Structure formats: structure tokens, C-alpha cells
Curated annotation (Swiss-Prot), chains A, B, C, D, E, F:
Residues 1-30, 118-171 are cytoplasmic. It catalyses: chloride(in) = chloride(out); iodide(out) = iodide(in); Ca(2+)(in) = Ca(2+)(out); ATP(in) = ATP(out). The lineage of its organism: Eukaryota, Metazoa, Chordata, Craniata, Vertebrata. This is Pannexin-1. The modification S-nitrosocysteine is found at C30, C301. Disulfide bonds join C56-C219, C74-C200. It is found in: Cell membrane; Endoplasmic reticulum membrane.
Length: 318, 318, 318, 318, 318, 318
């Protein structure tokens, strides 16, 4: 398995029939969530993890048992206010210990907006795309055979901003969490490397009077050199996601082609060039249609005709 | 696997054809049960668990065997009244040792109300939704073709409070267990961190007279720093679930739309605007219908007509 | 996996098309068998199991090899009459060692009555429910179209007590084993905690004359603190099962509804209100029917009519 | 997994469409083979197995390497005639070491008779039951419509003792192996517990002259206390199987009901009350029929009629 | 898993639609190959394997590192001519080390003849049985309706010895390998048990002049006591296979019944009582037919008639 | 699992609907690739691998840490020119260390020619066999009913040498790699066994002046005794493959039967006895046909007729 298992599991697999999520939003989500899980898995892979997260230089007179006590006591001490000293103050010692949980927190907080979309909006969308697609097939079938119900339905969706507010807020939560992650990772990468070293003391309680124990044990958080390097990789990738997520808000500019023009070739259709530059749900339906209706037989036939036209009897010989 | 396995297993998977549980109740249950299982799994993950739960500072004259005896004897001693001293009293030492079992107890106690619902109420519900849905399809088919059995059936369900009392009590047990968990976790997080340190003594029995053994061994429960931190995460999330669970009791306010109005467009139907503001089973059926009948072809057709109307021949050209 | 695996395996899964076991008997069996298997799995989970079950305080002059001999010799000695002393006598040391096997014994002994039912009675039942259900569908079909073979068959089952004696004895064996478990667990929980400590001696045979070996080694069964706590959980749950199992014997009182009255609406049926208050197999068939025939289309139709009646042409418009 | 895995694997699962083995013979075989495999799995489960099977008290002057040599040399020595002493003689030391293989031997030797039946007799049987069952359905179909080939075939099977001699010998081999196991386990349980202790000596060859090595090392087979206890469980269960296996030989008494009487109700059948009290293959066919033909639709119909009779037009209204 | 896993994997499972191998040859092959694989798996099972295959008694002055060097150097030395002494000579030390590979060699060499049969002969056979079986069904269908192509085909196969020479040679290779295994195992079991002990010397090269190192280290191959015992089990079983394999050569005597006589009842068939006592391929086809054509509906019908006869209109009422 | 797993995985399984590879070439490839993978798996199986690949005799004054440094430093040193001495020179120490990679290299280099055939030639072949087979079925169907397109197609394939040059070159690469492997393994088996011993020195850098460190450490590559033995097994098997691979080049001699003669019985066919003794693709098609068309119903019928003939109305009664 080694490292190479992790590539098969988190890179070569979609580890997370209509497309109810746009490809950009799927890739943004899969990168944003999948990367920190990979980085955590690498940071502790036995190819690079030598052993314990901590070690401390106990005096040579200590038994092996007393040395194991010092190591494990000081691993507990890193989060206890009195039994420490470091010139950085105690704060970075928390981050060095809890680094994998903090990345896991960002991984989950970046997943929740997509999970909310899957449950709050996808089923409310799925019904209506299926309706619109089947009605468009009737419009095509009628033209080959040769009421405006779907046109009146879409004209009604133009008078609404319910789903688009769910979508924008889902994107906006993802944006904020990515920005906060970039701020955190920039700070954590700024920690001076020697803040992985700190002075411990076991002289709490009964041991406080024992003259055979030194007043300080020097300890090192061996893994910190890995975490800081991997935090820079994470910071770079998220700094690239930021402008992509911002681009997702520009819905009325994201509509690539006015596909309904391909049906507006037909006399059975209507001038539904309804590029709503106001943020209205119909504009978001257009994006989901442009993602899905490439599957439609009618679209394929009419787009071929449109591309060649760039004559209805031709449809009979297709 | 590492930490990242746990995300795939407990976050990215529904690890727990009609929907017989409401989406809010499924998410509340899946969070309430799934979170402590994740937190237990994290608290002992080898990325953060250094080793043994305890260590004790045996004298340097002790053999490695005698030191391993002290560690393991004191791990047993934490729950034995005489062989301990701590300024906190003995009580917190129990909680520090048994922390994973106590979270597991809350996980199970939060699952049982949903398991009871699955067995006590779901099959008694499943038959009746299927009946109601199929009869509504007849009402729609009759209107396209153009006895009040389902109307009389629903009118009879209005005269009952059997299933709603099962539902409310199921919710109420979940509420109480969540509140008790929040009380416990608030206390456990309030324990002073140095209560992870205690004084042990092996001088029971034969050892009582041995002058070579010190009267106290200082011991530390190394994991306690993790448990207290993770208890705060658990407390925060459950403190957010509390108001959501309370909201579930407001059944007559939870009905979002009077969907039967969409069928009351038809002359074949009746004025079943039976928003029972009394807690009557029909009101709970309305919630389960609003969860399920979005799947009905008749609803889809009539809701499109209703939305456009916001003419029966139109149904022939759909 | 950790602890949380055990919840997925033994709580969230039915780890054990007609329903040939009543839901109460399935839940009683699944709790009675499933709980001790979970408790065994917890008691040795590495989240709480520190290491070896025993440790002994060998003198500081002993090599690591001699100390490992003392530990392992005394683990054997706990069941050997001469090489021990404890103020409790030797008996509790057996129970402390063999605790997981004793729980496993109760787990199996509680499963066997259900396994016997599956093989001795379920196939003899399965044929006859299928017969009765299909004949009741004929009675319903005949009434819609508008010999007493099934009525005469059921009237004959009233003259028998074969299957009910199998059922009662199956329940009675489960009752006895649960009561014996409660007695045992009450005793084992009553053992004074310091009975986990005992005095060992290796001075058998050749070692008997060696003045360098101490006459007693103090040893502790580190796990005993877990077993006693978990035995209280097991005792509490089984003490709740006892009255539920007792309730199962009251077969003629357990019949919730006289469902055949719903068919006795029809003129094609007969007055089979045969609530046998004598313990006769027909009464047990009624319970299995009330568990199964909620699946019947005829029952669903006629129960809707019965509920509304609380007219045969109405059946034509269903 | 722990202990509880073993319950799921060997108790709650049939780990070993006609029924070609009688239910009694399947249960006898599954207990006889399945129990020792479970007992072996328990005896070495890490919940009770502390560690190595042997330990020896090497002098304190020995290095850890020399002590590990003594332990492993003496584990080899238990089966070597000269390098041992025990007051029991050497024999029980073999049994204590090889205990799991000896149970495995009994497990396999008890399986082979069932494996022989599956290959030597089951396919020779399977054809003929299918023939007999289908011909009986013709007899029933003919009576509803209203040559003795199957009657003449069964009358010919009465003149044979081929299959019954295979069956009896299969049962007899199982009986003998169970009895030999009970004899062995009774002996092994009779071994005095201190026969787990023996005196080893490494002074073979070059070491023979070394005055620094003691003439005897005391050793203990730590696991023997488990094996003796588990042997008593195995002995008890097999002592219960013995009378059940003996009962299987009484084939002409095992026929519970003269099921062909249910077909002898029909005028199309014949007086095949052929309860052969001589050990003739037809009598064994009767047992396999009584195991299988409860599946036949004809039997179900005619048994209902027979039970009510306890009229052929009635068959038309079933 | 333990030992009991191995029973499930190699005894209770066929771990290796026409039957293209005779049942005797399948069982011989499955025993011959499957047994040594089981014995290897047992010989190193952790229930009996204590640890390392070797240990050597290094002087007490040696560090743990130097002792581990002696053990591992001598494990290499067992196959090096100069750095050894044993009164047996060096030869048995090879066999003791390489015992599992030598059994694996016999396992593979016993499998290859069956693998050759599967590829060299089974597809050349499979076509012709299917042909013969279907033509025999025509002969039966013609008799019920009431050219000798299949008879002329079988009469031609009588004039050939191609497939029988493949079969005999396949059996003969299996015989030779089994006999050689029995010779080897008899020798290996004859090795005096103390040949597991040998004298090693590390004084090669630079160490040759070091006066602190003893001239010989005594070493023991701890596992040899297991291998010799298991070799006797293997020898016994293979000594039972030898006469069974020899019996397989007697093809013209192995034909149990002249099944074509059952078809020679029909006037549409011919006197194909072609029991070739010369070793001719048709005789081998008879064995494969007697293995397969028990599946034929025609055979079942005609054998019932033959058994009763021990009239063609009777076939119409079957 | 042990050794026996490896037999199930690499011997009893085809671990690598037309047959697009000839059976000889499949077996040659499966042996050539499968054997070294098995041998690698054996050479490190824990049944024979004692532990570390190296050990070195550090002085008794060294701490366990310093000894582990010497072992691991010298494992690195075996491939570093200055920090070694051996009378063999440094070269064999590379081969002893990298032995498993070198076998893996041969395993892959022997697989690539078959992988190239699967992608470069198999799909270009697959279409044309399907064409030829279906056209031959027309020729047979026409004769039963009673243009030379397939004959003209095959006559055109005679005028080509495209596919045969791909095939020969694929075989030739396999031949060369097998011969180079035999040369390498012969050399590696010729290495004097004591070349597993070498003199290391840690006195690089800072240690160069330390008088407490000896100038040489003797080290041994413990595994080398296994590798040399297993290399002889590999050499023997590949020396047997060499003449088989050479035989594959004799394509015009490998054609076993002139199967088209069986169709040339028909008047609808033509004298396609086109045994091209020139290396022309049609000759290679003949081999693939002789591998595949034994599946054809037409071939089976006509070969039966041909064998009996060794009359066309006979085909009507088949």
C-alpha cells in the first residue's frame, strides 16, 4: 500500500442520472475536501513518520521506564499552562500537536455546503429538469410530426429567486471557509521552526522536591517539520481555489451558450432567449440545462442542424 | 487509513422506497449518534495517541518489570477507593478512564428512539401512505378521464392521536438524552486539567512493609487533554441540536404548504384543507405526504398547472 | 475501527418473506444475545485494555526473564489449589480469569432457544400461514365477484396444542437462562474489588529450596475493575428483559385486535371470533397472522372499509 | 472481533433445493465438527492467552538471550525422551503441547462421514426423490382431472439394501469417532494439573560440562489450565451426542407419519403403507420424503383435506 | 482465525457443467495436493510455533546484539559446509531448514498432472460427451415418437488409444510423485531427533582470532519436533493413496454398469455392449458417460423402466 | 496464509470469448512471469525468513543503540565503494542485496511481450476470426440447404506478412529475455557462498579518529543462502522453457491438422489446403483457427461425418 495506496484512494477515485452539481462545483468541492485528507494521510505515512511524535532528552541516570514517563508526560504537558516554557509562548505547541484535527475540521467544514445542497436543493431541482427535458422532447416530436406549458413554466421561474439564494449562500459559505483556512495556514507556516522545541518539567506534585530530577527536560515535536511543509502545499492550492469560487457567483456571465436558440429554430417553440441578467432562478436552471441536455436526442439532432445551418425534411433522414 | 479513513466512514457515508423518517429527524439522529462515534475514533487515533493511557514515575532503582507493574497496578487503582489520593476526590479519575464508554453510551441512547420508530411506527405508516398515494392517482386519472373513500379515510385519521403520541414521545426521549449529555459534557469540560494527575500506592498486602518502595507514585492520565478538548466540540454541536429538536414538536407549524390545495383544483376532489392545529395524526400524515408525494406524477403535473395558474384540456398535451 | 466499529457491528446492524418470529421475541433475543457479545468486545478494547491481564511485583534483583516467568506462572496458578492464597478463597480468581467465556456461555445458551424455534417450528408454521393467507384472498375475491375449507381448517387447529407447547417451552428456557444470568451477575458484582489481588508462589518443585526467591509474589488482575462495572450494565438490562419475557406467556391476552372481524364484514365469511382463551394453537396462529397479514391487499382494502364504517360496491372503485 | 467474532462465525452462521441430509444428522454433524473448532479458537484467544505457551525460571545470572534459549529449547525438549523428567512420565507433556492438533484431528475425522455421504449417496438419492415427487404430483393432478409406475418403482426399492448400508455405516463411523473422543477427553481431563510442570535440562552436547548452568530448569505449560477446562466442556457435549447418534440407527422407528396415507385417500393411488420394519432402502426413502415433500403443493392440499376429514369436488375450490 | 480457519479453508471448501474429472481422481488430487498445504500451515501456526526457528546458547558475557548475531549467523550457517559440525553430517540440517519448501514442492508436483489434464484433454473430451449425450436423447425421442451416426462414431472411438494414453500417463506421473514423497517422508521421519542440534562457529574471517568468542555455539532447530510428527501423518495418508491410484489404471474393470444396455432396451438402438477389455478410448468414454449421463432425462426414464422390468406405451404416462 | 496462500494465489489461480493467445504461449508466459514472483514471495516468507537481512558482530562494549547503528550503517555500506572490503570485490554484495528487485525486473520484462500482443495484435485479429467463423457457418448452412468471399479473403491474407512479424518479434523478445535470465542466474548461483560475508567499517567522518571503535565489523547477509538455492530452481525451469519458446517459431510445422479439409468435404467449399510453408499471415490464422473453431457447431457436425467417413442427407438426422 505505502504512499501509492493514497494516490489510488484519493486521486484516482471519485471517493466522494441527472447531474445535480455543476462540474466546476464538484471539482472545487473534491479538491477542497480531498486535499487535506490526503495531506493528513501523507504526514503520518510510515515512509516518513519515524516513530513517536515527541522525544525528550532524559538524563542518562534515568531508567528506560522513567524516560518513557518523561516523553509521555510532556506530550500531555504541551497543553497545560504551568508545566511549560517556550519563547513563542504556549500557543504554537497546541497547533503542532492538533495539526491533523485542524485539517480534518477544514475538510468537514468544506464538505457541509455540498451536503446541504444535495439534501436542500437537489431533489427540488431534479423533478423540474426531468419535466423540462421531457417537454422539450415533445416540442421536437411535434415539429417532426408537423400548449406553451413549459414556456409558461419557465416564464414563471423567471419570477423567482428561491433556489439561486440557496446556491449563492452555499458557494459563499465555501468561500469563507477557504479564506479562513488560507489565513490559518499562512500563520501556521509562519511559525519559526524552532518552536517545535520546548522546555518541559515533571516536577509537579510529589516530584517537586526530588533533587535527582532536572528542572527542565528539552523536548522536540519531531513531526512539525512535515506539517509546516505540507501546510504550504495546502495554502498554495487553496489560494488557487479562491478565484475559481469567486467566479462561480457570476451566474449570468457563466451561461456559455443560449441553447434554447437551437430549439427556437423550430416554429413550435418561442423566443425564450431569456438570459436573465438579474439573479433569477431561471438563469440557474439554464446552467443546469446546459450541463444536462447535451444528453437529449432532440438537442443532438437540432444542434447538428444548427451547426450545418451556421429544411425540416432533413430531420426525416437523420 | 489514518484520520482520513474516519471522514470517509462517518461523514461521507450514510453509515446508519418511501421516506418513513423526516429529513430533519434523520439529520438530527445521524449527527447525534454519528458525532460521538467519530470523536471516540479520533481520541485514540494513532496520529495523536502516543501510547499507553497511563504512566507513573517509578524510582530509578526499579527494574523495568517493577515499573510496568506500577503502571498497570495504578491503572487498576484509579477505581479503587483506598489506594488513591487526589485533591479533586476520586470521582474525576473514573470519568477520565471511562470517557470512551460514556460517549458510546450516549451514542446508543440517542439511537434507540430512531430504532423504536423504525419498528413501532414505520410499518404501521408505510401501508397507509401507499394507500393514500394510489388513491390520489385515481383522483387525478378520473379528472383526466372526465367514491370519497380516501377523503373519508383521511377524515377518520383526523379523529385519532395514536401515531402522533408515538412520534412526540420518540422526539422527547431524544431531547432529554441530548440535554443530559450537554449537562455531563459541561461538567467534564469543567474539570481542572491537573485532575489528570493523581497519587497511587502499591503498598497493599505483602508490599505494605517494604521500605524499598515509595509511599506514593505520581501518575498521569496522558489522554485526558484530548478528551476535554473533544468534549467541548461535542458540547457545542449538541447545544445546536437542542433548538432543532424543540422545533420538531411544532408539527402544526411545520407543515410548509397545503399541498392538497393542488388537488383541490380538481372537481373530483374535496376541500381537504384539513390543517389540524390540534395535534391529530392527520397533521402528521400531512408532513409525511409533503415529504413523499413530490414523487407522484399526478402532483408534478398538477403543481405545474397550479404554478402556471398562479383549462383541464391542458392536461392532455403535457 | 476502535470502539465505534463495535456500535456499527452489534447495534446498527441486524447481525443475527414471512415473519416467522414475533417482533417482541426477536428484540428480546437480539438484546439477550447481542449485549454480552458487545460487553465482551468492549472489556478488551485497546482503548481501555492497557496490556496484560496480570502483573506481579517481582523483586528488583530479578532479571526481566524471571519477572516474565512470575507473571505467566501466576496466570496459570490462579486455577491451581495449592499455589495460591487469598482471603476470599480461590473461587473468585476463577471467575475473574474466565469472565469472557462465562458471558459467551450465556450468549450461546440464550441463542439456542431461537435456533430451535427456527428449525423445529418455523417450517411447520410457514406452510400453514401461506395457506391461510391465500384462502383469505379467495374469500375477498369471492366477495368482489359476488367451501368453508380454511374455516374448517382453523376450527381444527383450535383442537390442538402442539405448536403452542413448543413456543412456551422455547420462551421458558429463555426465561430460566436469563434468571440464572441475573443471579450470577449479581454475585460477581458483589465480589469485593480487592479480590482482584492475590498472593502467588513459584516455589513448587526445584524452586522450593531457593532462598533467593520470596515466599509470596503479590499479583493483580488488572482487568477486574472493567468486568465488575460491565457486569452491572448486563445485570440491569437483563433485569428489564425478565418482565418482558414473562409477558410473552400471556398469549390469549397478547392478541391486540380481532382482525378476522374485518373479514367477518363479508357475507362470504363466518363468525371466526375464535379468541381461544384456552392455550390452543389457533390462538398462536392469530398472533402470527396479526404479525403478517397487514401485508395482504385484501386486509388493506377491508380495513379501510372497516375504519370508514366505524356498501360492497365501494370495493369496485378502490 | 475478539471472542464475539467467534460466536458470529461458528454459532450464528451455517459455516459448513432438496434436503439431502436429515436435520438431525446435520445438527449432529455441525455440533460434532463445529464445537472443537470453536474451543480451539477460544483456547488461544488473546482475551485469555497471556503470551508464550511456555516459560522457564532461568537463573538471575542469565542474559535475556540465554533465558530465551532455555524457554525455546525446553519447548522443543517436551517431546525428547532424554532431556526431561516428570513424575507423570513424558506422555502428558505431548498431549499438553499438541492439544490443538488433537482437537483438529477429531474435527476432521467427524466431518469425513458427512463428506462421504455428500459424494457417495446424495447424487444417487437426488435423482430419485425428484422422480418420486413429480410422479406424486401426477397422481394428484389425475385425481383432480377425474400406470402404477412410481408404485412399482417404490415396490422395487423395497427389494434393496444398498443405500441404507451406506447410511448406517456413515452413522457408525461417526459414533465410533465420538466415543473415542469421549475416551480421550476423559483421560486428558484426568491428568493431574501439576503435570503442566516439568524439569528441563539444556546440558546436552557442549553445554554438558558447563558448571555455570544449573542441572534442571523448572518450566510450566501456562496454557494447560485452559485446555483441561475446555476439554470438560467438549466431553459433556459429546456425551450428549452419543445417545442421539444411537437413535439415528432406529430408522424404522424414526418414521414419524405414514404420509402416503394422505395420497391413499385418492382412488388413483394404492395401499403403499409400506412401513418396512426390515432395514430396506424404501424405509430410508420414506424418511427423506418426510423431510422433503412438505414442499409439495399436492401434499399441502391433500393434508388440509386429510386434517379436515380427521368430497373430491372440494379440491376445485381450494 | 487460529487453527480453525485452516479447517474452513482447506477441508470444508473445494479450494481447487460436465464433470470432466472422475470423482476418484478429483478426491485423490485434492487430498494429495491439499494435505501438505494444510500441514505446512499447521507447522507454523502461532498456536504451536513459539517464535524463532533457531536459538543458540551464547555466553552470558555477550550483549543482546552479539547474541542476535550468533542466532542469525548460525541460521545462515546450517547450509555452509565449513562452519558446522554434526555427528549426522550436514545433510539433515538442510532438510530441517527447508522442510516447508520441500512439502510445497510435492504439493505443486502433484497438482501439475491434473492441470495438464484440464488443458490437454478436458476440452477435447467436452465436445464429444455433449455430442454423444444429445444424440442419445434423439434415440430416446425417436422411440417415444415410434441413422446410426452416434453408434458409428462410438464404433470409431473403439479404434483409437489417444486419450487413454494421456489419461494413463497423467495417473502414472501422480503415482511416481506420491511414491517418491513416501520414500522421502520415511527417510525424514527416520532422522534421529537430536539431529536438530548442531555446533555452530562464528570464527570466520576477522573473528577467527578473537579469544573472547567460544569455539562452538550449541544451537537447536526448535521446529524440528513438529515437522517430524507431521511428516508421519503425511506418510500415512500418502501410503493409503498409493493403492487407490494403482486401482485407477484398471479402467476396463472400473466400468461399474453397462448403462448402454438401458438404451438397448429400445428398438431404435443397437447392441453397443462394447466393453472393450483392450485399453481403447471408448472404454474411457464409458467411464465419463457413467459419471455424467445420470443427469439425462432419457436415462432417468429408461432406467426406471429397466428397474421395474428387472410396454413402450408406459413412457407416455411418465 | 503462510506458504500455502502462495500456492493458492500463484499456482491454483489464473492470476494473469475468443482465445486470442495460443495455449502454449499462455503457459510459457504464465510460467515465465509467475515463477519469479512466487520465488520472491517464498524467499521472504516468515516460515524461513528469520528476521533482518543483515547482522554484524559489534563489540560487547557497544550499547544496543550502537549495535543497531552498525547493522543499519553496513546495510547502507554494501553499495558504497570505500566503506567495504571483500575478496570477491564489491560486485556480488549488490546482487545479494538487490536480488528481489532483479527477479522482479525479469518478471516484468517477460510480461511486456504478452501485453504488447494483447494491445497491438489481438484486436486486429479478433475481428477477422469472427468474420471467418461466421462465413464458415454460412458455407455449412448452404450445404444443408442444398460467393467465395471468405475464400478470396483468406487467399488475400496469404499475400501478407504483417501479423506474423508482430508475433515472431513478440516471441523473439521473450526468448532473449529468458536467455539473459538464464545467464544471470547461472552466474549468481556460481558466487561462492562465503561472499555473503564482508568487512564493514563505520570510521567515516567524525568516527574516523575514535580508538574505541574497531577498524572492521564482520557482517553477514543471512538471506543469501535462500536466494542462491531458489536461483537454481529458477534456472532449471527457464532452461526448460528455452526449447519450448524456440519451437514456437516453427509456425508452418505447428499446424497439427488441415481442418479446412473437413469443410472441403462440402461441394460449397474450395480446395483451401493452403498450408503456406512460407511465413505468411494465413498460416498464423490457421493456428488461431485450430485453437478456436473447435467451438463451431458446423465443425463438430462435419468432423463427426469426416471421422465416420474415415451422404449429405445424414446431416438432416444429426
Amino acid at each position: 500500500m505505502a504512499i501509492a495506496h493514497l494516490a489510488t484512494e484519493y486521486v484516482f477515485s471519485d471517493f466522494l442520472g441527472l447531474r445535480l452539481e455543476l462540474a466546476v462545483d464538484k471539482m472545487v468541492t473534491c479538491i477542497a475536501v480531498g486535499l487535506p485528507l490526503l495531506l493528513i494521510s501523507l504526514a503520518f505515512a510510515q515512509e516518513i513518520s519515524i516513530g513517536t511524535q515527541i522525544s525528550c532528552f532524559s538524563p542518562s541516570s534515568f531508567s528506560w521506564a522513567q524516560a518513557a514517563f518523561v516523553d509521555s508526560y510532556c506530550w500531555a504537558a504541551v497543553q497545560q499552562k504551568s508545566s511549560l516554557q517556550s519563547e513563542s509562548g504556549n500557543l504554537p505547541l497546541w497547533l503542532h500537536k492538533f495539526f491533523p484535527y485542524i485539517l480534518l475540521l477544514f475538510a468537514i467544514l468544506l464538505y457541509l455546503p455540498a451536503l446541504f445542497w444535495r439534501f436542500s436543493a437537489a431533489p427540488h431541482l431534479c423533478s423540474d429538469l426531468k419535466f423540462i427535458m421531457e417537454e422539450l422532447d415533445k416540442v421536437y416530436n411535434r415539429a417532426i410530426k408537423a400548449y406553451p406549458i413549459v414556456e409558461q413554466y419557465l416564464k414563471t421561474k423567471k419570477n423567482s429567486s428561491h433556489l439561486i439564494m440557496k446556491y449563492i449562500s452555499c458557494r459563499l459559505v465555501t468561500f469563507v471557509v477557504i479564506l479562513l483556512a488560507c489565513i490559518y495556514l499562512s500563520y501556521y507556516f509562519s511559525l519559526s521552526s524552532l518552536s517545535d522545541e520546548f522546555l518541559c518539567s515533571i516536577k509537579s506534585g510529589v516530584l517537586k522536591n526530588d533533587s535527582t530530577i532536572p528542572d527542565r527536560f528539552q523536548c522536540k515535536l519531531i513531526a512539525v517539520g512535515i506539517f509546516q511543509l505540507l501546510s504550504l502545499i495546502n495554502l498554495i492550492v487553496y489560494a488557487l481555489l479562491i478565484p475559481v469560487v469567486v467566479y462561480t457567483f457570476f451566474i449570468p456571465f457563466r451561461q456559455k451558450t443560449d441553447i434554447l436558440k437551437v430549439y427556437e429554430i423550430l416554429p413550435t417553440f418561442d423566443v425564450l432567449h431569456f438570459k436573465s441578467e438579474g439573479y433569477n432562478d431561471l438563469s440557474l436552471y439554464n446552467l443546469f440545462l446546459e450541463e444536462n441536455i447535451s444528453e437529449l436526442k432532440s438537442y443532438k439532432c437540432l444542434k447538428v442542424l444548427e451547426n450545418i445551418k451556421s429544411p425540416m425534411l432533413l430531420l426525416t433522414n437523420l
